[PDB]
Design a protein around this nucleic acid. Sequence first.
RNA 1: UUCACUGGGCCAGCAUCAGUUUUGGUGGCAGGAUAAAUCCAUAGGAAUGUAGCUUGCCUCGGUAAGUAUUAUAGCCUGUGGGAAUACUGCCAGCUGGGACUGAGGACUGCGACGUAAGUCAAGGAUGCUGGCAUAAUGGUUAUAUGCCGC
RNA 2: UGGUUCCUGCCGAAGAACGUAGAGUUAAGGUGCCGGAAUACACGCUCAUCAGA
RNA 3: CAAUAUAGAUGGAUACGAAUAAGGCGUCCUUGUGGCGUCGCUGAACCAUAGCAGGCUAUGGCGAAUUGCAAUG
Lengths: 49, 128, 88, 184, 171, 114, 106
Amino acid sequence: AYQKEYETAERNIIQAKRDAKAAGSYYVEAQHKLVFVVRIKGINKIPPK
Amino acid sequence: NWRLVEVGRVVLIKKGQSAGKLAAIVEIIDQKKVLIDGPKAGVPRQAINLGQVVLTPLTFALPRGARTATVSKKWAAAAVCEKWAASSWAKKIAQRERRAALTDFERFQVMVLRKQKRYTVKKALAKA
Amino acid sequence: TKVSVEGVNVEKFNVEYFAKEKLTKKEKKEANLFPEQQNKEIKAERVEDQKVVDKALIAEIKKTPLLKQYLSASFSLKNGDKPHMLKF
Amino acid sequence: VEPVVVIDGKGHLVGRLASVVAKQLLNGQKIVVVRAEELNISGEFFRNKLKYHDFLRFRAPSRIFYKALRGMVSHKTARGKAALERLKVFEGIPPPYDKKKRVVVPQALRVLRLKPGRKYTTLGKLSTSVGWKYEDVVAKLEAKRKVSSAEYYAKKRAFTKKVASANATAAESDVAKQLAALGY
Amino acid sequence: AHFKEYQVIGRRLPTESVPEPKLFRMRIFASNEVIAKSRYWYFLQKLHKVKKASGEIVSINQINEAHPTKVKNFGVWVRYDSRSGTHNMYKEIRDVSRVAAVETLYQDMAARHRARFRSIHILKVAEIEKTADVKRQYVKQFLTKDLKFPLPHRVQKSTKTFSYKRPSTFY
Amino acid sequence: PKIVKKHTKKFKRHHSDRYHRVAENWRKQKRGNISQPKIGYGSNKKTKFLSPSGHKTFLVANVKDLETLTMHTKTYAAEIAHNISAKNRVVILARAKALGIKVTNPKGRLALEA
Amino acid sequence: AESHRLYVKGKHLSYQRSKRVNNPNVSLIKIEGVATPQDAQFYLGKRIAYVYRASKEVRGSKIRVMWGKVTRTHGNSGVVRATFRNNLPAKTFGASVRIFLYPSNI
RNA sequence: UUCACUGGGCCAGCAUCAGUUUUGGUGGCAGGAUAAAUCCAUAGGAAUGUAGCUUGCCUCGGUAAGUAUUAUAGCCUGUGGGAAUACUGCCAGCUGGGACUGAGGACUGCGACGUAAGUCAAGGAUGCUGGCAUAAUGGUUAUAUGCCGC
RNA sequence: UGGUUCCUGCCGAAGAACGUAGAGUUAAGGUGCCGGAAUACACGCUCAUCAGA
RNA sequence: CAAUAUAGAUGGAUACGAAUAAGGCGUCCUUGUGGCGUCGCUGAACCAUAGCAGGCUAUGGCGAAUUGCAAUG
């Protein structure tokens, strides 16, 4: 059910973009409600905030 | 006697995806870049820096900015594929390809035939 | 370079055929502390196997040109021999 | 690939050739550098003249190139001393090296590295201008060498022309076609 | 890196009792979409008082060349900051595609003017269609009839240590 | 098992060669080119106290001490104490070879005559 | 008849090093006729011998051999890393070292 | 006493694995302007104007400068048809090479393949072979090399 | 004022927090030679009678 | 002690000169700053290279093994 859900979701978003192109209007995307964050700097010389 | 960068100068891309394919300068861009197409060799029409390619002493007449179907027409009508194959340099290139293509029993036959040819030449030598 | 193996009935001898022999009686007490060196010879059955394989193998070789002389000559690396480039 | 590498110095740059040779001696390749007087320096004569001057506060071109090369190698180490012991440097080409081929190092060539329309400097003129009073001796020997070498090359070309004739009459034979079949 | 054309549209947000604002469209040359969007906001704030929080991007798009086989001629308007003062500059470029011309233009501006990619603000790239509208002499140098010249830099990378040949720029 | 040692050399005091009055035992100073002892060099607990033969050594003074290694022959190895007289060392050797225990130091204070 | 070489000779260049600290464990090898790391992929894992000649005759000969193998490439020029059983004495920098074809993939 | 079988430890090489990693070769997808191109079909256009024509100097025919928009070259643009490929992403696609590692120690667990019994790459390496008692091998020193060290 | 005697572990104030190793990947910094690593590639500028790095 | 090797042997260090916005080679003549053709665009070349680490005999004919699957050998 999960794999079917991902497939239907991606085909729906792509077809919604295709429907915006076919209707000549614009599609706006929903904001991505999840990110991933990676630490870049060492522990020294960091402000306490 | 100089080669010149010009339209109809058939060229050879020594370095790249071609790494040796006969192309032709269709148009110049500047002192650095040109437009080429090699549709007989299979390399597509593209812009290129001149360092990646070498000029051949062969040329023919090619129209300015000629399209690819016109290019292949003038290429075949030039028949510079045969003029290229008749050149000793392309013969040397095919030869150094064939030397890499050799097998060890082939290379041993090369050894034996070099012995036999050398025997016949040294008989032909020291009598003339 | 390939030859046909089909003329030879190779299947007979096995891994066990090449098992190196053993001694008994603790080498018969070293013949009572006197060494003996007649054991150096090859068993004749090994020679017969070599001949039987060798006939049907030479019969394959003689159909191909220059292959006997190829197997007779050894191989070395000359100057400029680059085995990563040397297609075998 | 060669035991002793013989390197001509004509038409070459100082530092690039020095870097190449200094690398190869630390690699263990034995090198003799010949016709050293015909090394070329970037920039005009006068700049390089002032550089030898303010360095000086040995005049032979071999000593100059040896100086430049010795600067690049860590000379104080025993390994660097063995690397320098591999080296020979000569102005002109004395015997026995006159009868052997002299290679060139393309990444140190003057005609490739220098842009046209630049002043360069001949090392022999520099050495004579700073007190190496032997340059006329050099060209006198080199003229005789070029005479005998032209003789050798004229003989060699005629003999190889005979070899070309013998290979030409050896052609069309079936052993030649079988070599063609194998590619030779 | 190698850039890309981008149709980028922004519409700064339809508020309550203000439906459908005016869908401002620009075309950005950028290596990716992210810096394209950043540059789009960086121009849109210079257009009028927006912020990236004030509006949104409508549609990010790549647009290819219609005819990437033909060598076109271009007249380009650039503005940038010789840090204290700004000035415009009009350059003419003979190039196959648009985005390669913009690439070479950034390289030339960084060469001659020490200006960064952020300091350079592209005004317009447009094809010069007919000849003799090439105001610059150096592009006009390549507009001659039957143009031929020899190669400079016959020096190549020799790729080996020692040469037996005593080589020659034999061209 | 495969004995890891983690440190082949020894741990010497700083400037121990520079003076003859200074010993070579480890004493804490109170460049980094000197190896300093620390608990990271401590050997693996299985591999700890193992000979190159692969045994754990055990000092033996007399035969009653040797009989304590009767069951643990493959794990341990008997070592005769330095001060055992030569009459007792041969008795210990005969008893140990009867028990089949590897003596670490045979031929101590002893020779084989005729 | 004239040649009996079943190896590629190549120079023991150096130890793996920074500007100040060298690793004697990894050694650096220049294989002749190799300029690319892709050509050096052929030489991966191959069995290397440093052949040298001693004064004394250890077991019927005065010539001794260290062994080891190629681990990985090093740099752009086709310079090749190597690890031996015992490390090299470092007076063998620029020495000819034999690289054998076994373990052969072909 | 006869006969038959077998042998410890270490160090190697190879195979099959497992874990980390590195370097290849190769396939199928999915998106875009549903790639753009190119190719083909059509209409106009122009010149860095091809054929033709006119004219003039001139080596019996070369030039030039007009004409001439395709002719005895073509180009460009517009529009229509069709793919392919690039790029980007995905594959619980295939396959190869190299390095390092072998902790743990009767069984239990999750599995998977198997109709079944069983098997297995599945709760950490086993199998095969070689060498070795005038050992194998290991250590000690002194010197040398390289790097670092007031 | 100067000196004040064994070890290890743990706690411990007023580019990167480092047990001992093996393997890999990198920050910064570099990749003519010393010196490990592209005398790579691309585009422009400078020939200085002590540029410049 | 030797019938040897030391910074690193195990096919061969295999020879024009100059020019480079030019050369070379061959050839022809009007011997020239002539003409013609060729060539480069790497030595990835060339030369050497079979036989017990290279046997014994006359395209032949006998020998090689067991050093047992790598361990300078």
